[PDB]
Amino acid sequence: ITEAALVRDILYVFQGIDGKNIKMNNTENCYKVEGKANLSRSLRDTAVRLSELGWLHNKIRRYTDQRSLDRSFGLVGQSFCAALHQELREYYRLLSVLHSQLQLEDDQGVNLGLESSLTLRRLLVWTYDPKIRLKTLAALVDHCQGRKGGELASAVHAYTKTGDPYMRSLVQHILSLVSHPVLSFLYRWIYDGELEDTYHEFFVASDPTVKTDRLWHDKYTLRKSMIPSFMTMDQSRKVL
Amino acid sequence: AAAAAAANLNAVRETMDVLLEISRILNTGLDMETLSICVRLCEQGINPEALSSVIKELRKATEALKAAENMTS
């Protein structure tokens, strides 16, 4: 088995595609290398290491597809999915650059023992930071699984508490992007009384059945579950 | 005073926008906050020619300091 074939399979896995000799094992929920004898055990371990990245990629893509189709995610959910898609796009841009570099290494044909030659170890090194990024994104997705609206915002704030400064910065950027629409809807409701809560995602609830006599008492309510974790309960009461 | 403060803030914003455009053409490394500080200094009567020479010297010094920090880190 040529190394180039493994490179092609790894690029496919980075694209979420099963390679010719490396296929996703649904039983292991991971890409598995075809049992052809010519794979080095070290090479097998490297394939498994890359298949962890491919599994993360496939999980991310499954999440994106699951939420891109869900109209019930609401505007805030759509914004969160959009931010996730943007980060995935950045990752895919990096992956495309890496693929072009691998294509250059394959096309040059020379086993240049230079420190610049695309080795499986060099590929792993170049993807190490991307691997950490994808791990962080996957952990965020897992923690945010099933959460929506203010619960999604609270989950995002929980992920903002990560110690990793790169993860912290990324999560801060994602939180700000997702909150810009969320804060817009919330603040528009609490300051202007506008409630574009198609999914009842904002922390202010309005009872349309409440008469004007109880308008001050009953017309407006707090969706406590929809209260973002970046807002205090006293802040939420003031907004209400 | 409050009206004066608001006028100063609006003037700073306008100056920052103009300065941002000039800066973008200017490709030299001058920031808005330093510009505001200089404006306060300039309001105190600093010679604009002296100010420009100082700014150029500060940019050269900042580049030398960045090289020194990159060598010492």
Place this chain on the structure above:
Amino acid sequence: MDDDIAALVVDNGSGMCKAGFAGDDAPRAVFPSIVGRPRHQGVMVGMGQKDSYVGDEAQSKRGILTLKYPIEHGIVTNWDDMEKIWHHTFYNELRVAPEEHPVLLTEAPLNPKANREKMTQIMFETFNTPAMYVAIQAVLSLYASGRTTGIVMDSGDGVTHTVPIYEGYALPHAILRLDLAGRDLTDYLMKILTERGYSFTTTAEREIVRDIKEKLCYVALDFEQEMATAASSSSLEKSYELPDGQVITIGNERFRCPEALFQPSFLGMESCGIHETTFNSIMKCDVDIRKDLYANTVLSGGTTMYPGIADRMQKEITALAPSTMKIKIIAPPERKYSVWIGGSILASLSTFQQMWISKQEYDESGPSIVHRKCF
């Protein structure tokens, strides 16, 4: 750590001498320009009392020392006692060898060339300094203002000077000296406090009255309006508690005292007001530079620390200067220490390091170098 031998910075204010190292933001030593010698040689000789104390040491020994001021009304009056004071400052407060450090000296405006020569001789022969310079205090404050043309108002305790400077050169025909400063205002404040019923008669009570003036007196933008306000409202009136718990009340004296800057007759001084002195200095200056001098009016010295002095100076200069003259009064918040700051700034220039008079140049030219080398 490269021990770059710091030049010495000595700010000789009319009231207090302030000294420190070049490149410091403030003088490291600041003490009254007073040298005290023991009043009773006999009794305290056995207790290790020095025959004389200088600066803060003179104040600490004031009980047993007779204090002398080698600088009188901003003018050096005892060159031997001034040299002894500088030596004491150097060796005890700064704890430096002046032979190892260049020394930037300050001078009063219109300081006699011969007095500069005697100071230079003392500095070069007694302290064996490797390099020195003598600068006019107001010039250093002007350099601290980043200007080469303008008027510097340096006001200490003992003397006031108005020094027009054009393109880095002082305008000697337009330099004015005023023998009215913080000491005269302190005596006026003591008088008005005695009239108020607070008795201040001792040099300790005189210093208390001086501190009261520095803390509670301010310069009115309009002296008559502030006096009228204090007479019609106690809002300008201030009570002051003496260290013995006696409460004194000060009304227009809060602004009448510094009103002497515009109306020195309010202090019983025959000197012209700050507006008249500024006008006379400007008129003695070239018309082409007068606009820039008005635009570059720098306040310096401890007597420029008075609150409201900037507004009063602005009003007065506007009433006194030509309406077409751009007048800008610079009253730095540190103008009480402006001399020292300017000396530190000036002495920090790399190109200035060649301007110091070296010990070799002193030995080559003698004390007359002050009149021959420093122009």
Place this chain on the structure above:
Amino acid sequence: MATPDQKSPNVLLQNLCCRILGRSEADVAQQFQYAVRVIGSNFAPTVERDEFLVAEKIKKELIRQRREADAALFSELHRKLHSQGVLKNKWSILYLLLSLSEDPRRQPSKVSSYATLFAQALPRDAHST
């Protein structure tokens, strides 16, 4: 002792405004700004760099002014100018002079009609500037 060198458009426009208005640049700031705005976005890719068209136009104008002798003199001047290699954009100079030319007859004090003809010139726009 001045050597020809490319100076910024601002300097040339300032000097031009000063000499045309006979006032300081401060006194023509509004006019300077208006002219600067109009001039600052104006590149002529449509102008055909052909002196012959300008010369023909000048000749026709002179004939219209009954100045055939002046047309011949202008032709000789153009010939002399061509002999000298000082100017590179002669088409531009001729166009500018013709545009700024004022008819002495407009000799007389007015010009008979202005039935501008389709004759004109080329549009050069055909090229990918």
Place this chain on the structure above:
Amino acid sequence: STLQQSLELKRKMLRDKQNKKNSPGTLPLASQESAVVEDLLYVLVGVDGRYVSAQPLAGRQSRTFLVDPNLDLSIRELVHRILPVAASYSAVTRFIEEKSSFEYGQVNHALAAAMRTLVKEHLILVSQLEQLHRQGLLSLQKLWFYIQPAMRTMDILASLATSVDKGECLGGSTLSLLHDRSFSYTGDSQAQELCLYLTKAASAPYFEVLEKWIYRGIIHDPYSEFMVEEHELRKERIQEDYNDKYWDQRYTIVQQQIPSFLQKMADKILSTGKYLNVVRECGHDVTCPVAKEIIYTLKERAYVEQIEKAFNYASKVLLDFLM
């Protein structure tokens, strides 16, 4: 494996944060050398070689390797001498990857991130050496020489990691342990520099919490790492109960969380934060004008002088408020 201990540390830190957050003999000699180069290059990445395979890790032990018995005895001894570096690398990577979980708190997460950066640098070096071998430019002695300093650095780092794991050091206790390790590298200038970088990084969130406490009297400590711990005192009884629950019980000192480098100033920090918290609880909004970035330094105790200045500022503000 170090991964299990680091994961346990993550879970423990998660609990603390929740409490804080109320929210060969037949091979040619040249071919034997080449095969050993490939195996070592795999082992540096944690991959078993063809002739040298890692033995399974039994417990919190260093990774063991099985080497083909038919290797040259001198070659086998050199391999066994190098294998310790790969075992340390594998253990460090396991610890880094486990304690990198958000549950491990910001300090342990930052420590893991720094370790990951150093592991990345190690991998880069290893990749360049792999290239030299692919270039045929790598000899066994050159490899040994080049890795010897790297081996010592990795061994020191692994010993520090194992000591932290044995101590389960967290927050201020972790900062104290880091300080002690930095003192342990007093004889190793390179290791001392590395420890200083690591200490500054781990103190960055701790110094942020300290800054928040001293400048605002607010403990923004999600992981309960600061030497001062806040206890919820019923404010009604803080004024009502004879006990100064606001002054004495609202904020308590976590002795275990006292950084060894801050221990001499801990009480001043405690008092400053207590005063600021009282001022905020008094309804006086205090904007601290002395709020500055706190940076960990090993030689200079500049943070101590800054703490003293902040203490003096808070004391002055409190005295003026009381008078």
Place this chain on the structure above:
Amino acid sequence: AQELCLYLTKAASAPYFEVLEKWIYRGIIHDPYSEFMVEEHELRKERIQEDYNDKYWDQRYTIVQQQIPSFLQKMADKILSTGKYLNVVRECGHDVTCPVAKEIIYTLKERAYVEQIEKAFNYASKVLLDFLM
């Protein structure tokens, strides 16, 4: 996508806002496709005065509920009244030049068009009141 949709909405409102302007300023529907929220029905003016039904006021102009823009839905009735008043003024033989006629621009965050519509409604109401008095 939000910016793109906003551009598209402004472009699609440009002809719709032009029609609205024509209705509010002149009371004239130049709608070949009957797209405006107000639909005109030919009421016989001769019988509009004769028939007890205000055919001029009630039948000449009708609201097309389906053609009511959701962003204008809150102002639809005011728009209807404005156009009714303008049509009445024209039918009264008073040529009404609307002094408040301004370009209507689609805005997503600000209901500036609503405030302008209110100003125009007030102008038409004042003109009609003066005419009636």
Place this chain on the structure above:
Amino acid sequence: MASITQLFDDLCEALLPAAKTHLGQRSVNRKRAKRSLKKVAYNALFTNLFQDETQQLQPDMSKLPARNKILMLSFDLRVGGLGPKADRLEELVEELEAAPCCPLLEVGSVLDLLVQLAGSGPPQVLPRKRDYFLNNKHVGRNVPYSGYDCDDLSVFEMDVQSLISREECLCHSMIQETLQVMEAAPGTGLPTVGLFSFGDPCGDRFERDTRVSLFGALVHSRTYDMDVRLGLPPVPDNADLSGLAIKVPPSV
């Protein structure tokens, strides 16, 4: 008012380089640099204070109204193809000059400084994305009758080509940088110099000689290259004629 020294201190602090994450030595270096930068700054500020009149800067533009300098920059921007940006700059400059109550007393001097600050501002400017309405030439109410001239279309095509080329160039530069980092010599480029490498003996002469002598192993040679094939000096041709002399080390 703050002192000029205080204002320069604030300016130097804001202008101080953001410290690279290296904790310790950079603090002291920052303090010393602050002092040095203050000295340099004052030298530049007072460059003309004690400069002879002979270094009179060109008198022309200094007497020009600041507005005229702004107009000059606007003209250059229009010539620079920034016509809409030139217009916006002119509008903003007219507004700034037109402000009837400038809260700054030296607002004219501030504008003069900005002219003096021309070319002194910070610059890759991500290309302004085409607003859907901006390129909507055929989307309008009062569309002027135009030809089919696609000059603007060619400009837009060039802009898109530039954007794509910029993305490709960024990709190529990033690739080259990442390979170049990966391509350093084995053991070279490590940030912890000497901590994982045997530190290069460039510093100490004793260490330097040890390295070039390989801890004193080399007798007659010195080398920095680790791949040198060790050779000895050739046998002199006269050895069979003159015998073997004891080589005396040169006194130099």
